Ligand binder design. Structure first.
Ligand SMILES: Nc1ncnc2[nH]cnc12
Ligand SMILES: Nc1ncnc2[nH]cnc12
Lengths: 227, 228
């Protein structure tokens, strides 16, 4: 047709809680174990998908995404899961759609790069604008990524001062974005909040990870019907 | 030695041109593969079958490069070469450090009871292969830490020193390479040479001595290849 179509869809979640619902909706998925990650291929809500369980953190997400792209060559990558909320009117359970991802813990500013900009990379990784529109159809703005669980006052304050427009944080989104940039593949990050900055985040996370992961995944399921 | 395991196909990774140029020039008619924003050079080097890898800078690029290296070329080990910043007392520009183990200095999930530097679902440290370490020694030994920051401000250096009193040097890819090798279960080693020293005009130092650092590290690797 002449429609913006993504025929093979990659989906990636860090933890079992972020991928279990998706996997359970798949028609007789095939499972591959590779590089410490898991890949499940099959059909889901009508679409051809590769669902990936990456593990937590930038390194794990990067090997997951790079294996996904090299071995399966999807047409786009959608990352789903939970995040920590920073924007004022954000609550537990709220969804944020990323317009772009940045790293909040990257600092090579001694060499002229922007805060959060890794050498040889762009400062930010914009999400595909079609994927954003589809997600909206089913808050939009900046999410930042770092290899730390944000819950101490000073760390939260530094991150707010560095990125005043940051809406939420997590531990994989910008890595996935970077790898997709390195491979030139469209992507999107969708997160639901499992905790809010300054508000008992450890206990919150443990209590809300399951339902936040489901909530995010349900947006993705809705998306798959319109793609 | 006779009792040591063998490594028939050797993977070598450097972040920057300055860290792989010399090694590449000593390869015999290398094939080149461009993929995922990385480059792979396949051929013979100092008598060994090798895949030399130019990864790009930082944890994410190193991770991509190492994933692809391993899944596409399946080498029997991985050796990381390049520059680092010195922390230990008696390090000077150009000095070589062999990693006995890698840790991340910027990873912090301690709120969940993990050690400082330990990523969730990962060990706290990634020990380098017992055979490779000894081969490098035959050609300081200790902890090198990795983070996605160029380390040169006083507060940053002091904190890293506080979290890791045993850290000899810092750089930006080694423990990522180690984690990926751990995930694939493949032997690895990190060798680095100092391009700058903590607190001493590090931006200028790095700019001036990245090439000599890349060189000294690469020379060790060439010698290692001679003994594998
Ligand atoms: N507070 C937080 N920091 C980092 N990653 C998170 N994922 C969910 N909540 C998070
Ligand atoms: N000071 C430094 N910090 C991080 N990586 C480095 N590589 C070389 N020097 C470095």
């Amino acid at each position: 047709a002449m429609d913006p179509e993504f025929m093979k869809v990659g989906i990636i979640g860090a933890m079992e809680q972020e991928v279990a619902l998706l996997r359970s909706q798949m028609s007789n998925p095939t499972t591959l174990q590779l590089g410490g990650c898991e890949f499940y291929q099959g059909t889901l809500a009508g679409k051809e998908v590769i669902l990936t369980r990456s593990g937590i953190g930038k390194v794990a997400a990067s090997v997951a995404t790079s294996l996904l792209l090299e071995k399966f060559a999807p047409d786009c990558v959608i990352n789903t899961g939970s995040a920590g909320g920073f924007a004022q009117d954000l609550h537990i359970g709220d969804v944020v759609i990323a317009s772009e991802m940045r790293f909040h813990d990257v600092d090579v500013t001694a060499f002229g790069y922007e805060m959060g900009q890794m050498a040889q990379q762009p400062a930010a990784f914009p999400c595909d604008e079609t994927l954003i529109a589809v997600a909206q159809d089913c808050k939009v703005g900046l999410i930042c990524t770092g290899d730390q669980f944000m819950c101490k006052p000073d760390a939260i304050a530094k991150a707010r001062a560095d990125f005043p427009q940051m809406l939420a944080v997590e531990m994989e989104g910008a890595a996935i974005g970077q790898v997709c940039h390195m491979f030139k593949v469209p992507y999107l990050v969708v997160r639901a909040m499992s905790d809010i900055a300054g508000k008992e985040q450890v206990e919150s996370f443990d209590a809300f990870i399951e339902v936040a992961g489901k909530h995010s995944a349900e947006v993705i399921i809705k998306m798959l019907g319109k793609l």
